[PDB]
Amino acid sequence: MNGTEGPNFYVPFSNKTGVVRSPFEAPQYYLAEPWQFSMLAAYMFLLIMLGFPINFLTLYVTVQHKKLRTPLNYILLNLAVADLFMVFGGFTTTLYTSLHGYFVFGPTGCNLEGFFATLGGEIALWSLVVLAIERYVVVCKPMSNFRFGENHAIMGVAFTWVMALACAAPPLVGWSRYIPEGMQCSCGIDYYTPHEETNNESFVIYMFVVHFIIPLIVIFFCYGQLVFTVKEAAAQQQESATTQKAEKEVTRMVIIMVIAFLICWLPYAGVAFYIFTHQGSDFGPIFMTIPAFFAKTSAVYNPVIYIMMNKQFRNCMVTTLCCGKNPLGDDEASTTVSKTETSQVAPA
Ligand SMILES: *[C@@H]1O[C@H](CO)[C@@H](O[C@@H]2O[C@H](CO)[C@@H](O[C@H]3O[C@H](CO)[C@@H](O)[C@H](O)[C@@H]3O)[C@H](O)[C@H]2NC(C)=O)[C@H](O)[C@H]1NC(C)=O
Numbered sequence: 536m537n538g539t540e541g542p543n544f545y546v547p548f549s550n551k552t553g554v555v556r557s558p559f560e561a562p563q564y565y566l567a568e569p570w571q572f573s574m575l576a577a578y579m580f581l582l583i584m585l586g587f588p589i590n591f592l593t594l595y596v597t598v599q600h601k602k603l604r605t606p607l608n609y610i611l612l613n614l615a616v617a618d619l620f621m622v623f624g625g626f627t628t629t630l631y632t633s634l635h636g637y638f639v640f641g642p643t644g645c646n647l648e649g650f651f652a653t654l655g656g657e658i659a660l661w662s663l664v665v666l667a668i669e670r671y672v673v674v675c676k677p678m679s680n681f682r683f684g685e686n687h688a689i690m691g692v693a694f695t696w697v698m699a700l701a702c703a704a705p706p707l708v709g710w711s712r713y714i715p716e717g718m719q720c721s722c723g724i725d726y727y728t729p730h731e732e733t734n735n736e737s738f739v740i741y742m743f744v745v746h747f748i749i750p751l752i753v754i755f756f757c758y759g760q761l762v763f764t765v766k767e768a769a770a771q772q773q774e775s776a777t778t779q780k781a782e783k784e785v786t787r788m789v790i791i792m793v794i795a796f797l798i799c800w801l802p803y804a805g806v807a808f809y810i811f812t813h814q815g816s817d818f819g820p821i822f823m824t825i826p827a828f829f830a831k832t833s834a835v836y837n838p839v840i841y842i843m844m845n846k847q848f849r850n851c852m853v854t855t856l857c858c859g860k861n862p863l864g865d866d867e868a869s870t871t872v873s874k875t876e877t878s879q880v881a882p883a
């Protein structure tokens with residue numbers, strides 16, 4: 536056999552030399568050099584050091600500035616929360632696991648590791664479909680007098696958690712399951728064994744269709760809409776109104792956010808589909824370690840894109856960080872927001 540299937544795992548390594556050992560019971564240094572696990576460990580460490588501050592700061596700024604209440608300000612607050620669950624929820628176990636070369640906490644640690652990374656990536660995916668819509672509704676504007684209230688935003692946000700849970704929670708209760716991958720320091724869905732006892736093959740198709748192919752289609756199609764309408768070609772103050780102008784900006788970002796997602800998840804999803812379609816073949820531990828661990832940057836790139844592509848949020852952050860105010864920068868030239876400063880309501 537090309538690998539070592541276990542009742543709970545599947546090491547992508549032969550046991551012809553009987554050197555293979557349950558990744559819930561002993562180090563896996565026979566799969567790779569010990570320094571490489573240190574790499575994973577060092578890496579998970581730096582990611583937690585970046586992901587915590589960046590996501591918490593994002594979260595703190597959004598709340599403190601009483602005017603940051605657009606559908607986008609919501610979706611990104613949602614993402615910051617989901618990213619903090621990633622950091623504390625599973626990254627703590629993946630660093631702990633990398634440090635020992637195996638899942639000392641056994642399947643429980645594997646479930647934390649798998650669930651939160653899944654929950655996180657899937658909340659991002661669904662939050663992108665919501666943006667695609669909102670994006671659409673504003674650009675190609677379907678109604679002749681409609682506007683997303685905060686309620687809607689909270690709707691979309693609530694929706695992303697139902698959809699993400701629909702995919703991440705099943706494996707914790709008998710449908711498919713989380714199992715260690717690559718150097719066995721991370722945990723994902725089961726694409727390795729057909730384990731009928733927990734109905735793995737069906738869940739995998741359920742996830743690639745309901746939680747992937749489909750949301751992608753929506754998002755892409757929706758784009759093919761904001762193709763003839765709002766385009767990447769973004770000019771200066773007023774595009775037909777400085778209003779319309781700054782509309783082109785949010786869309787440019789929602790589009791970058793999509794590219795960042797694919798870069799981050801296509802390789803993983805790709806290796807994952809392969810394995811599913813080539814169960815038992817001869818792949819090694821590094822095969823999935825690389826995209827699996829690279830995809831964990833998904834807990835941080837969202838806020839970066841946001842702060843770099845949103846003059847208003849960046850300013851509210853500089854305003855916040857600069858303890859007092861003095862949003863130096865160039866401000867937003869347009870609206871601003873905060874708590875006691877110029878968070879002065881100014882609609883109509
Ligand atoms: C790869 O081949 C190895 C040799 O066949 C095999 O080693 C076997 O590992 C088990 C661990 O479950 C040992 O069983 C021990 O189980 C408990 C320990 O808590 C006790 O009842 C005894 O101490 C018992 O020995 C086997 O002794 C051991 N057999 C050997 C070394 O020949 C690996 O498990 C195989 N890799 C896999 C499939 O994970």
Ligand SMILES: *[C@@H]1O[C@H](CO)[C@@H](O[C@@H]2O[C@H](CO)[C@@H](O)[C@H](O)[C@H]2NC(C)=O)[C@H](O)[C@H]1NC(C)=O
Nearest residue numbers: 536537538539549812813814815816817818819
């Ligand atoms: C172990 O892995 C090897 C290589 O991945 C598998 O060999 C392949 O077998 C398929 C048919 O199942 C052929 O289409 C390929 O051409 C084979 N490639 C090679 C390298 O010979 C092998 O099947 C696997 N063994 C199992 C079933 O555990």
Ligand SMILES: *C/C=C(C)/C=C\C=C(C)\C=C\C1=C(C)CCCC1(C)C
Nearest residue numbers: 652656657721722723724800804827
């Ligand atoms: C490091 C831990 C990881 C990557 C744990 C598991 C992640 C998954 C099972 C992710 C699945 C998918 C996502 C988030 C994005 C769309 C494609 C997908 C279904 C492969």
Ligand SMILES: CCCCCCCS[C@@H]1O[C@H](CO)[C@@H](O)[C@H](O)[C@H]1O
Nearest residue numbers: 801802803805806809817818819822
């Ligand atoms: C960017 C998406 C990545 C898509 C995943 C490609 C899986 S490709 C697969 O990898 C194996 C490694 O053990 C090779 O042995 C095999 O020849 C190759 O076809």
Ligand SMILES: *C(=O)CCCCCCCCCCCCCCC
Nearest residue numbers: 587588589591592853856857858
């Ligand atoms: C105004 O004073 C100019 C901006 C300078 C602020 C320096 C930015 C340092 C970033 C550290 C913030 C970490 C957030 C805390 C998370 C717990």
Ligand SMILES: *C(=O)CCCCCCCCCCCCCCC
Nearest residue numbers: 853854855856857858859860861
């Ligand atoms: C509120 O306005 C304070 C700004 C918050 C960012 C923290 C800035 C730190 C100040 C610079 C410290 C220099 C480093 C010296 C190390 C010995």
Ligand SMILES: [Hg+2]
Nearest residue numbers: 667670757758
């Ligand atoms: Hg769109």
Ligand SMILES: [Hg+2]
Nearest residue numbers: 799832833836
């Ligand atoms: Hg990424």
Ligand SMILES: [Hg+2]
Nearest residue numbers: 850851871872
């Ligand atoms: Hg602001």
Ligand SMILES: [Zn+2]
Nearest residue numbers: 542543730732
């Ligand atoms: Zn079983």
Ligand SMILES: [Zn+2]
Nearest residue numbers: 698699702746
């Ligand atoms: Zn989902």
Ligand SMILES: [Zn+2]
Nearest residue numbers: 729736811814
């Ligand atoms: Zn199969």
Ligand SMILES: [Zn+2]
Nearest residue numbers: 863864865866
């Ligand atoms: Zn500026």
